[PDB]
Structure formats: structure tokens, C-alpha cells
# Entry
Amino acid sequence: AQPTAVRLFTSESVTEGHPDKICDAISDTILDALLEKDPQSRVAVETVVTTGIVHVVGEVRTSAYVEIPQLVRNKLIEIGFNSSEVGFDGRTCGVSVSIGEQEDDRAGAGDQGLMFGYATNETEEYMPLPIALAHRLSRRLTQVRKEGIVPHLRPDGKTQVTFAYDAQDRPSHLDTVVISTQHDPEVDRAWLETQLREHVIDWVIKDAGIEDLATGEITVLINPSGSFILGGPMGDAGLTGRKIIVDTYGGMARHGGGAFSGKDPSKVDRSAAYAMRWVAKNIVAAGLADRAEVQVAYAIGRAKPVGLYVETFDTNKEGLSDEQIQAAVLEVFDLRPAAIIRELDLLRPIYADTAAYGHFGRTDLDLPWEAIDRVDELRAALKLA
Amino acid sequence: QPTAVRLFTSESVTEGHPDKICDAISDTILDALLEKDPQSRVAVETVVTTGIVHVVGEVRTSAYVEIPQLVRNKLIEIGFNSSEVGFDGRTCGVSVSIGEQSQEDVEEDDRAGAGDQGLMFGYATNETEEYMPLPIALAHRLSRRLTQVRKEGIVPHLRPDGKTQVTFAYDAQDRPSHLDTVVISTQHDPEVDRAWLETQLREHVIDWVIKDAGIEDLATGEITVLINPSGSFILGGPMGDAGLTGRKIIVDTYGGMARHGGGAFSGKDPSKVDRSAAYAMRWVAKNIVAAGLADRAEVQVAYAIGRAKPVGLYVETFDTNKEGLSDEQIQAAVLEVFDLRPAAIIRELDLLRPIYADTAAYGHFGRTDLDLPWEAIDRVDELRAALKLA
Amino acid sequence: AQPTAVRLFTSESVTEGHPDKICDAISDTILDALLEKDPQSRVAVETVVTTGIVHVVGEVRTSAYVEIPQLVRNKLIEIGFNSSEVGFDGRTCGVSVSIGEQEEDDRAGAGDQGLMFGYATNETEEYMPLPIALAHRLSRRLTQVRKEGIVPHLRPDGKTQVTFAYDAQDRPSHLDTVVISTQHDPEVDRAWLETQLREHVIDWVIKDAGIEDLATGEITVLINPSGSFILGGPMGDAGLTGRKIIVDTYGGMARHGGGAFSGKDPSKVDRSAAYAMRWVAKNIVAAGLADRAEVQVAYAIGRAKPVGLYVETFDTNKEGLSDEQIQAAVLEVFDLRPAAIIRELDLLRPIYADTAAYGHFGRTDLDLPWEAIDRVDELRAALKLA
Amino acid sequence: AQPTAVRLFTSESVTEGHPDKICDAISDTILDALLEKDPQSRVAVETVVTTGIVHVVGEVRTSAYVEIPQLVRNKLIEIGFNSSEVGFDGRTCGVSVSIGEQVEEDDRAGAGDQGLMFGYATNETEEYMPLPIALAHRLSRRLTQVRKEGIVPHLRPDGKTQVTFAYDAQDRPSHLDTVVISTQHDPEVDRAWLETQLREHVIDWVIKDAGIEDLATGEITVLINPSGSFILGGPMGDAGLTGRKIIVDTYGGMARHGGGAFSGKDPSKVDRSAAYAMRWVAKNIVAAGLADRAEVQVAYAIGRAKPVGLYVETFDTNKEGLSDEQIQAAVLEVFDLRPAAIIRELDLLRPIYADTAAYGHFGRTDLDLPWEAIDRVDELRAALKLA
Ligand SMILES: C[S@+](CC[C@H](N)C(=O)[O-])C[C@H]1O[C@@H](n2cnc3c(N)ncnc32)[C@H](O)[C@@H]1O
Ligand SMILES: C[S@@+](CC[C@H](N)C(=O)[O-])C[C@H]1O[C@@H](n2cnc3c(N)ncnc32)[C@H](O)[C@@H]1O
Ligand SMILES: C[S@@+](CC[C@H](N)C(=O)[O-])C[C@H]1O[C@@H](n2cnc3c(N)ncnc32)[C@H](O)[C@@H]1O
Ligand SMILES: C[S@@+](CC[C@H](N)C(=O)[O-])C[C@H]1O[C@@H](n2cnc3c(N)ncnc32)[C@H](O)[C@@H]1O
Ligand SMILES: Nc1ncnc2c1ncn2[C@@H]1O[C@H](CO)[C@@H](O)[C@H]1O
Ligand SMILES: Nc1ncnc2c1ncn2[C@@H]1O[C@H](CO)[C@@H](O)[C@H]1O
Ligand SMILES: Nc1ncnc2c1ncn2[C@@H]1O[C@H](CO)[C@@H](O)[C@H]1O
Ligand SMILES: Nc1ncnc2c1ncn2[C@@H]1O[C@H](CO)[C@@H](O)[C@H]1O
Ligand SMILES: [K+]
Ligand SMILES: [K+]
Ligand SMILES: [K+]
Ligand SMILES: [K+]
Ligand SMILES: [Mg+2]
Ligand SMILES: [Mg+2]
Ligand SMILES: [Mg+2]
Ligand SMILES: [Mg+2]
Ligand SMILES: [Mg+2]
Ligand SMILES: [Mg+2]
Ligand SMILES: [Mg+2]
Ligand SMILES: [Mg+2]
# Structure
């Protein structure tokens, strides 16, 4: 048949005040506090948030002592949960702790599992446009509250971005922007719309440099359903590792299923994901392709990956195959868990910054896995100039 | 110039894995509530750690269910019936923090708005009878057989917690070509010699699945088999290993072969777009491959809170489109044929029934053991019709 | 010859805002709410409060459903904990619930072993010791003053204490010291409170009590004598059901069995026997058979018949009656089998939330069945008295 | 000539396995573990125990770190909760922790709180304890001895003992009337088997050990597991908290109580330190020939190191024509009841508390407790001009 429809692709983000991101953030704050004092701290800490209470749960091996309830109440306060009026208060909320405890170049993976990494040309950050934009809107929505550019806002928020795509699977036009924010009851829906349209949407669209993808009719949906007066843990339970697609590539890329936050870099779910980001970004910035995705997988006890899979979605260049690039990857990168930590210098308190507004393509941060410092070595292995 | 073999991996876990225990407890509560009150609103999270199950979230129902009894019964059925195994359902702790009894159905009205924003992906492939990718299909079969040989006593001394992993060598046109690596880690009784377990699992679990799945054609020659490749697995489940609902969404879907919107399925009633739309996309994709419009299809959908019609939809067929149709043409057919408003999905697929507990382990998709409404090939004729075909 | 030291006896009370009473009140709100819907409900509900969280634990058999989290949040709003400013808000607090256990009629045995004590004294019209009676009146008044606006800037958590000088006959003589620590808004000074509480709490209560003939001379008054009482309730201060048994009973003037009252349905002999034994003691003192009377009863699990009973009048017996003699009189007038006690006092009704602060006994402001002076005739008669 | 009835007075105790004494014991294991490393540790810890879970709660200020979960699981195993079989297992139960609050000197050490506390002593026994609570503690202690030493098999840790005594008209113990014991057991035995094993190896062994054969003549009504099957115990279906056994911890109802718990409180809490002191005061009043039975009440205001209350009562057992007021005068001169002085007088900054968490805090001949030393007799008499 002749009817065609336009393909729209969507990615979402959430603020630090979303109860899932609260948990990812408390988990990574506890990890950081421990690495500050004992860099070799073994840490797998789940946070759960429900009305009035934060549960801290999981396994720690450490020489340090850290005041977990103070870490929790303080992080809740930076986030902005500082009264019962806004629905949660760091100073007066519950904290419950249930923690217990159950290197070598060739020391094996602590678990089996699969981990994916992705990079693309479409943005300077090497990040797909939909999630990059969704993240920018969620960062900005927190910023205009914290710097007091828009008054009456509260920490809980979600953003969503839908883009029109050409037949070649390339971004073409910004179609639909959704922003839902928590706020005071003294503020309505019309006032919020002009505030966020001005100070968040129009602002990010300029700062991202995409004003040529945002001409004509754009559907803008601001708080399109219900009064977002209360939020965070009040009414809506949060857990660590329930925002893994927000954490990554916003659905543009595949995922091995493992969460990041609350895990020290010994956990291949976290460090191998970061490694695959590193490998992928270096594949693309070395001009071996426009888009690259790399899976790795491990067996518990074994140190050499049990698997590695390169895909460039027909963006391959210099008449190279994915099997050829992958050979180069094996030649350039060392993917034993203990080597990745050495290579990316991961034994440091840098994780709390990654718990909200993405672990990848972070221009506001300085992440070891975002370094494009293996491009030359890749080009050499493929006999390129 | 030199070349590497591309190797793809997917994993599964048994119902005894602490994350799957949470998913199963969450979907046992959902089922129990839908049996008494099909319009129940349920967003129920389970946490497990040493000695204790926490039940947490939002519930709006006219029914009463004994959560602690359901929790203990599920654990005893899973196999956690003793402190010797590391967790006993009869003696475990159960804490319940649930509210939202109205104090703070549109799912029936088809013009009713999504309950939240979000993205959802569905996928299908003619690689298997169940329209599923081989890696996850094999991993799920291995995890199901691991639990099966224990509950039926085909292999003695086994315990509930376990993990399975499958790696396949892939050709240059992204097709599976050979089984390369199989991993099976299982909780077990202390009096077991690895060699006896290695031989038992090789014969009763791996070899059995390779025949049941009909892939001996892909399992010739040298296959790497790792069984309990690390340490001793005597304690398992929540003992020294925290579990949470929604921490196995890739195992619950396509094993990394397809994309994902990030939402969990267990603990959520069909009014949750995160689950209903993902089941819908599985339906749309399976009906696109069953109608021979492609060999593989991936469909994404997205919604805005308070809005019935999706904000977006994305059909990919990975250059496998047939009948010389583009992906923009198959999508035109999809919109003509499928009602993707949430309320319409719930009705199209008759979702207000207690059928969710069985999905909480071994996958939501390609379940020939079950009869799930989103696995039905019942929209093929309508799709081919709107594509001026038959 | 050898010098004498005036004997000084103390009793203490607490507001509904004290974290331990928060727990007793919640436990008894859940009990009342189950009996409102089902009078045969079996209830053994413990409450724990700590920073931000109420835990409800224990065992129930009921045919009814009760919204525990709402009863809890509501009962914190009434107590006055309705903001993070005060250190606890019922609307945003945590609630976690771990409850389980999904002549035969009077030959029904008692659910447990145990000892329970009952006391009466003619010192007061409510037949309560002077010190715990005054104590209760002080903490009741401290709450009333905040909830009616008589004193502003007050917060719910508070403790009152009362020490009395006594004669050589174990009889009260004078009020030596009243102490009153209260929570308050940080916009207030101890000096302002000292005068406001002395006026509107201590002086009002000394009058309302009819105790001004014991009020003369120098009274030592300690008002917020330490630190600043700005936060209270569960903030920085763990609370548990069954942690205020002496405050709930006779303030140490009488003996105690050990059993908590709150969170227990009347089949729990810990409660129903102590209620019975208040009733007997009160009827002994109102019968003119002694000025002070204390009775101990003990049960064995499974046996309806008490295994022990022990009347004591501290040598204040009247009409030449021995304790043994009064004790045989009690057995004749009083069915002290669990099931009888329930029938006698009509306990299967929602009347316990009220008992959870300010005392279980001598409650003039209530209508408690165990406070009924209605076996006076049958006690006299059985003793050949007019 | 109206009819008489004999007066019957009762006391109870519970084993270390009773869910409430679990909490007290765990709370005092934490206190000890902290005093062991920091003697100035400020500890206000509550334990809660329900099916499968121990909640540890309250306030602590210490320079030390202790592995609370390790302390909990081990205490539960020592008690004998070491299996899902017996209804709770130390090795696999939950542990959740919710703690926080990281001119004369002894005059500025004012009381932590307001509160009344009570002390008691009596001639009736070698350990200066009333007869009922003394017998109940020995029965409950015996009831765990025979399990731990394999003297009576098929026993589990949960356990309750009650003791009723006939009283003569002068409020004095005449006859051992009724003994209750309810013990947790394996299914491999029944009420009848226990009936005879507990009689021979617990009850009869204790009557001889306590030397009350002359109270033990005639017809003793002995009720043993009188009701239900006691197969599962501890927290399995029965919530325990710290501070819900304060009368078993004291004198079994014979004496009065101020209503403060002991367990999980450091000696800076007067609820604990004053009560211990008051036992010490009363046990010296009685051993100094000054009386047969002595009860003393002390009371504090928060901020004030000087008691706001003192009350000596000897129940007309006072000797040498001395009034209660005169005995009180000497008590004041010989005893410093300021909180800091009590801690120093009895050396309370030591890990000695887990042993008081069961079987009584007073009259404890199996232990060596500061507040049990009769070492103020000579001084008290001197104050009354005696020899
Ligand atoms: C803090 S201690 C190390 C202190 C040092 N060994 C000492 O004696 O003071 C380490 C272990 O205690 C447990 N733990 C519990 N709460 C902790 C906390 N707040 N910080 C660190 N470790 C904690 C973890 O299992 C961890 O391995
Ligand atoms: C028990 S249900 C319906 C009760 C019914 N309206 C009645 O007659 O009592 C009411 C609410 O209780 C809450 N709830 C708490 N525990 C529950 C449980 N075990 N089963 C069902 N609802 C429960 C949910 O918020 C639910 O919407
Ligand atoms: C809810 S009651 C009666 C249920 C009612 N017959 C029904 O099925 O619709 C059943 C049991 O639930 C337990 N329970 C748990 N939470 C409860 C609550 N909030 N109110 C009442 N019972 C509750 C009690 O142990 C009680 O025996
Ligand atoms: C861990 S202690 C002393 C630690 C020492 N100052 C350091 O930096 O390593 C500090 C506070 O931690 C809290 N705490 C929480 N859990 C504790 C535990 N298991 N042992 C000791 N203190 C604990 C108490 O409030 C205590 O005063
Ligand atoms: N009224 C609302 N409008 C839009 N999003 C909301 C609203 N209330 C809550 N949310 C967000 O969506 C999630 C699910 O309700 C919440 O955790 C919060 O982040
Ligand atoms: N010794 C072990 N070998 C392999 N897998 C294990 C072992 N112990 C636990 N596991 C599994 O891996 C997860 C993380 O260690 C556990 O939840 C469990 O499923
Ligand atoms: N600053 C204070 N002064 C006196 N009593 C207080 C103070 N703060 C709390 N309290 C009371 O005493 C207990 C704390 O020791 C609390 O339960 C509370 O009721
Ligand atoms: N079957 C029983 N017989 C007697 N006492 C029991 C029995 N089961 C439990 N107990 C004790 O009585 C308490 C409450 O019933 C429990 O905490 C336990 O110590
Ligand atoms: K939720
Ligand atoms: K874990
Ligand atoms: K306290
Ligand atoms: K109980
Ligand atoms: Mg979530
Ligand atoms: Mg993982
Ligand atoms: Mg997990
Ligand atoms: Mg969602
Ligand atoms: Mg208290
Ligand atoms: Mg009791
Ligand atoms: Mg108890
Ligand atoms: Mg106290």
C-alpha cells in the first residue's frame, strides 16, 4: 500500500528529585563516601524510598566508617526535600540500614553478565539527540529551581522528547516535548507553561545548538495531567536501578540489564558498561563509523570476556567490516575487569555526579570513560592515517 | 585486516534468584488482587534481604489479600523452605508499606489518558517457533530446566538460586551460526562433587535443552561449558544478596537483542503503560513477522501522561522488510490496524485477569508453556489487507 | 537522739506527645477501630516510633479491615505532630506493618500466666494516690493549654513530676516539688514559660484539684530545668508500646505485675485482670473495709480459676476485719475468671484509646466500667455488715 | 467470726529464649560490646523482634564501632535460636539498624532525666530476695541449664515459670502452693513426658538447691505446659521489645517500681543506675540489722544532681526502736545519690550488663554485681551511734 506515516523516536529523563534517582544518588553518595576513605571498598548498596523513610540495604566490605543516616539526610537536602510541605524532609525522615558482607590483572569477573556501549556523531557529546535533549531539559528544570530563575518549583520532575526521523533512521525535527514538574499549590498550569517554555525549553534548544530542528509547530505538553503538588518518595516508591535506560542512551541503544549506582568499579555491570562507552566513542571519533554499539559479556570466575560484538549499522568506513574493527578493539583495549579499573582510574569518588542526568555524554563533568585517547592506536591497528 | 568472530550473549536466572523472587512476589499480589477485583490499581515493589521481605507501593482495590501468607507460600513453592538453604518462607519476616486506597475506571474509557509518560519497545524474529532471539530463548530454557530438574528430582542436591548464560557466534549478516559458550551457576547442597554436578547438568540440562530446542545443528564441535565456574554456591536467594522488583528487565524481554524503554513489568496492573504497551508492541512486532512483512521487527511507542493517543511510534525491520515495503509503509498499516490507546490495549488483549505471576520468571515473551494474549497471531490478515495484499 | 529526715515520695506522668504514649495511643486506636467493626477481635499490637517512621507489629484475628496507616497519621495529627517544624508530621511520616495470625463459656482459660495489681485509696475522690493523680492533672492540663490556646508556642511532647512530703503514718503531708518539662516553639524563653505554666498549668491544677491546703509554704518549681525542649515526639527519642506501665497505673504508690495494657483486647488477662483488681480494690475502700487496699491476682495459661489472690490494706483495715477475712469476702462477690471479667465490666467496646494517655484508673473525665462503685452492698452483706 | 481465706502471692520469670528477654539481652550485648571499647559510651538502644527480624533502634554516642549484626546473630545462636526448625535462626534472620545521636564536678553531672526508682531487700533468703521471684528465677534458670547441658532432651529456648506461695497473716511465706512451667519443645515429646521430666530435673532439683523442702511438704499443684502445643517459640508468632519484663527484672511484684527499663541503657541513665544504687542501699539497711524488709524510693529532676525525692519504708520490721525517718537520715549521710557518684561508687563503666538481661538483675549469687555488696553496714550503724 502507498500510505506512509512519519517515524517518531522518544527518550525520557528525570530530575534528581524523582524517587528512583533519589535512590540512585543516595547509593552513589554512600559509595563515594566509602572510596574517599578506602578506595578498595567492596560496595553493592540498594536504596529504597517510601513515604517518610529511606531503606539502605546490601553488602559492604570496607576499612572506613561512614555516617550513612547523615549522608542520606544531607543528600535529600541538597536535592531539595527540606520539609513535610514539599512531602519529604531529610532532617526528619526515617533511615534504616541493613548492610552486611555475605585487583590481579587476571582476577576474574565477580558475576556473569552482558553490558552494551554506544556512540554517534549527531551531537558533540557523541550522544543520540533524543536522550541528550531529554537530559538537558531535566538538568535545566533542576537548575531554574536551584538558581531561583523560576520560583514555586519542587524537586520531582520528568521530561520527554520525541523527534521525527527520516527513512535513513536520522533525526529530522523536534516533534513533541513533555515536561512534568512538582511545584507549590500557589502556582497554576498556564504560568508554569510560559515559565518553563521560556526558561527551560527555549533555553535548552539554544544551548544545545538545535534551533534549526525546532522551527514551525512543536507540541509542548507541560504538566498535562494532575496537580504535581506532592512528589519524591511521598505517594511513589523509588528503588536503585529503575532508571537504567535514562542512565544510558534513552532507548537508542541496547542494554545488558545491570544497574550502575551503589556498585563499586569491581562490578562489571558498571565498569564494563563504562568500558563499552569508551571503546564505542573511540570507534566513532577515530572515524571507523558514524554510529557504533559494542556488547561485552563475562562468566563469573573468568577474566577474559566470554563474548564481544561490534555493530556500526552500515555506518562502517574505510571499507572496514565490524569483524575487522572488533579485531582492532581486541588489539587496542584490555577488557579484563582489573585492567579497565587501571585504564579508567575508577577507584575514586566520582560516582555521585553520574546518579542523575546520565552517566554518558556529560559536558558538565570530566569522566574517564568519555576520553577519546585511543583513536590513534585504533587507526594504527587498521593501517590507517 | 585481521578479523574477530562476533559473539552475542543473553542470560537468564531461576525463580530462586532474589530479583526474580521480588518480581514473582509482586505479580503474585497483583494476581491475588485481580482474582477478587479486576479493576485493582497495583504498583507493588518487593525487596528481599537476609531473613525479610519488604512489600511496598500503591494499591487501590475493594478486596483484601493476606500478603504475608502469599509471600511465604511463594517462597516455599520456589524452594526456600529452610534456614539450611538460606531462607525459609514459614519463618521469614514480612513488612508491608502500602497505601493509596483512593485517598491521595479510566482504564475502561478508550479516550482515557496514559497514567504516565514513557517509551516501550516490542520485538519478534522468525529465528525460532516462539518468534524469539536464540540467545535469550536458550538461556530461558536452561533456567527453566535448572528449576525443573530440582523440583522433579531429576538431579538431586540442587537449590533454587541459579543463573544461565548463552553466547552464540554470529555471521557477518548478523545471524546466529554456532553455540560458543554455555554458563550454568546453581545453588546446591554442600555434599556434592563438582564432577557429578558437571555431568548431571551437562546431560539433564544443557544436552536436553539443545535437543528440545532443536538446535543440535548449531551445537556441533567444541562448545565452552562453564558450570559453577566460580566459588561454592551453597547459600542463595536473599542470603547476602539483596533482591528488588524490576532489576531483570532485559531477562524479562529479549536478552539485549532488542531495545528497551526502561520500565519494569512486575507489580503493575494492566493500566501501567510500561507493561501494557510493551506487551502491545510484542503483539504488533510478532504480527508484522507472522504476516511476512519482515524477518525481524522492532516497534517503539511513547505516551504523555494524561493523553490517550501515543506521542510517538517507530517501526524498524533491520533491512529485512519484504514485499518491497519501507518501514514508513508497515507503520501506516500498524496505525490503521492497532488501537494503541492504553484502554483499547487492555480490552483488545483481555488483560484484567490473574495471568501475571507466570511471567515473573523465564520471560514475558515467547512462552510456549503459557498462553499469553500478546503472543497471538490474530491481526495478520488485517495488516496484509491494509497493505493491498492477501 | 538520732536525727529524722522528712520522707519524700515522687510520681511522674507524660503528655500524649511523649513518644512512648504516642505508641500506647496508636496501639489502642487500632484496638478501638477493630472492636467498632468486630467486638470479638483478638488484638496484641505493639507500636514503635523513631525518627520519621511508625512500625506497627503483632498478631490479630478480626473479620474486619481497618486502614492502619490512616488511623496512625490521623492519631499523629490529633496529638499535634503535623509538621517537620515540630519534628514529626503524621501526613508525611513512615508506616510499616508486620501483623499476622490471620461451664466452658466461663471455664474458658486465660491466654497466659501472670500477676496483676489493683489499688484504691480514700486520699482522693477518684480513689487514686495524691502524687500520680496530681501528676496526671498536670500533664492533662499542659496538653489542654496548648490545644485551647491558653498558653501559645507549646509543642506536644512533655513530662510532669510531683514529689510530696509524707507523715510518719505513710500519709501525704505537703507538695515539695512539681517539675514540668515541655516542648515549645524556638521563639519562647524558659522565663516566659516558667510564668505561663506556673499561672495556667500548676496554679490552675492546684485549685482544680482542691489541694491548696497542701499547697501552702515554699513549693520548689523546676520548669524546663535543662536544655531546650524544641524537638520531641519520636525525633531523637525512640518510643515503644508498654514502656509507661507505672504512669498508666498508680505512679509507683502501688505494685505492678509487669504487663502492658495498650494494644491488647480484653481477653488479654494482663489488661482485664488489672482492670478487675482496680474494681475490687475500689469497692473494698468505698465499702469502708480499709482506707488503702491493694489486691494481687495470678492466672496459669489454660486455667479460668486464678491460682493466686492476695488482699493487703497496709494495717488500715476497719470494723476489726483481717485481710484474710476481706479476701474471703472478695472471692464470694467477685467472679475473677477471664470470661466473667469481660461480661462483668462489658469490655468488648471501643473505649481504650481514651485510656492510652493520662492514666487507666481514677479517670473522672471518663466513664470506665472498672471505676464503678457498685459491689459496696454485696461486700458488706457477705461480711455481716450494715 | 467471719470466714478467712489464705493469701496467695505470685511471681513469674521467663527463660533467655522468651522474645522480650531476647531484646533485653541483645540490647545489653550491644551496651557491653560498646563499654568494652569505650567505657564513656552513651547508649540508649531498643531491640524489637518479630517473625524472622531483629530491629535495633535508638541513640548512641561512642568513639567505637561494633558489628551490631554479628552481635545480634551470635546472641541468638547462644540463646539456642539456630534453626528454622525451632522457629528462629540467628544465622539467617533479618537485622535492621536505625541508630543516631553520635563547684563540685559530680554536682554539674545533673540527672539525664526526671524519674522515680525503687530498691528492695528482705531477710527471707541468703541472696536478700523475696521468696517467689527467687524461686521463679531459679526454675527459669534451671529450665535452660537442663536444655544446654543435655539433662532433659527435646527442649527449645522459649520458656515461662510462675510460683505461688501461701502467706501467713503477718505477710510471711508459709507454703509453696502452685508451680507453673511452660517450655518450648520438639514434636518428638508431649505434655505428659514433660510433666514428669520437668518435675524431677527442674522443680525437685531446685527445691533442694534452694533449701525449701520445709516449704515444699504436702500437695503442690504443678501445672506443666498446661495449654496448647509449645513447639514454635521466640519471635516466630510473638513480638518482643526491650523493657517489657521490668518486674521479672526486679522483685516479681513484691516491691514497687518507677517504670524505667534497665536494658540497652548506659549507667548515665538514672532509671538503671539509681535502681541499682537503691537495691544497694536497701540490701545494706537489712544486713546492718536495722530491719528485716527495706524498700527505698529515690526521684530526680533533669539538670539536678541532687535527688528531688527519697523515701525509706521498713514495713514495721524496723529494729532497735528506729523510725523509717531516722534510717533515712543515716542513708543520706552514708550514700551519695548524685548520678556521677553512683557510677563511681559501684564502678558501672564495665561490660557486666548482658548477664542481668535474664534471670534477674538482683539477688544474683551466680554473678558478682557491685550493687549487691553489703559494705555500708558499719558506716550506716555509725551514723545511728551503734556498734
Ligand atoms: C566500618 S567497619 C571498619 C572499621 C574498623 N575495622 C574498626 O575496627 O573500627 C567495616 C564493616 O562494617 C560494616 N558496616 C556497617 N555499617 C557501616 C558503616 N556505616 N560504614 C562502614 N561499614 C559499615 C560493613 O559490613 C563493613 O565491612
Ligand atoms: C482492604 S481494601 C478494600 C476494603 C473494603 N473497602 C472494606 O470493606 O473494608 C482497602 C485499601 O486497603 C489498602 N490495603 C492495605 N493492605 C491491603 C491488603 N492486604 N489487601 C488489600 N488492600 C490492602 C489498599 O490501599 C486498599 O485500596
Ligand atoms: C482483614 S481481616 C478479615 C478479612 C475479611 N474477612 C475479608 O476477607 O474480606 C483478615 C486478617 O488480616 C489480618 N490483617 C492485616 N492487616 C489488617 C488490617 N489492616 N485490618 C484488619 N486485619 C488485618 C488480621 O490478622 C486478620 O485476622
Ligand atoms: C562509628 S562511631 C565512631 C567512629 C569514629 N569516630 C570514626 O570516624 O571512625 C560514631 C557514631 O556512629 C554511630 N553508630 C552507628 N552504628 C554504629 C555501630 N555499629 N557501632 C558504633 N557506633 C555506631 C553512633 O551514633 C556513634 O556515636
Ligand atoms: N501530576 C503529575 N503529573 C506528571 N507526572 C507526575 C505527576 N505526579 C507524579 N509524577 C511523576 O510520575 C511518577 C509516577 O506517577 C512520579 O514518581 C513522578 O516522578
Ligand atoms: N558461588 C557463586 N557462583 C556463581 N554465581 C553465584 C554464586 N553465589 C551466588 N551467585 C549468583 O550470582 C548473584 C551475584 O553474586 C547471586 O544473586 C546468585 O544468583
Ligand atoms: N530538653 C529536655 N528537657 C527535659 N525533658 C526532655 C527534653 N527533651 C526531651 N525530654 C523528654 O525526656 C525524654 C528524653 O530524655 C523525651 O522522651 C522527652 O519526653
Ligand atoms: N503453648 C504455649 N503455652 C504456654 N506458654 C506459651 C505457649 N506458646 C508461647 N508461650 C509463651 O507465652 C507468650 C505469649 O503467649 C510467648 O511469648 C511465650 O513465651
Ligand atoms: K511506583
Ligand atoms: K546485590
Ligand atoms: K529513648
Ligand atoms: K505478643
Ligand atoms: Mg520506578
Ligand atoms: Mg547484574
Ligand atoms: Mg540484582
Ligand atoms: Mg514508570
Ligand atoms: Mg521510653
Ligand atoms: Mg504478658
Ligand atoms: Mg511481652
Ligand atoms: Mg524513663
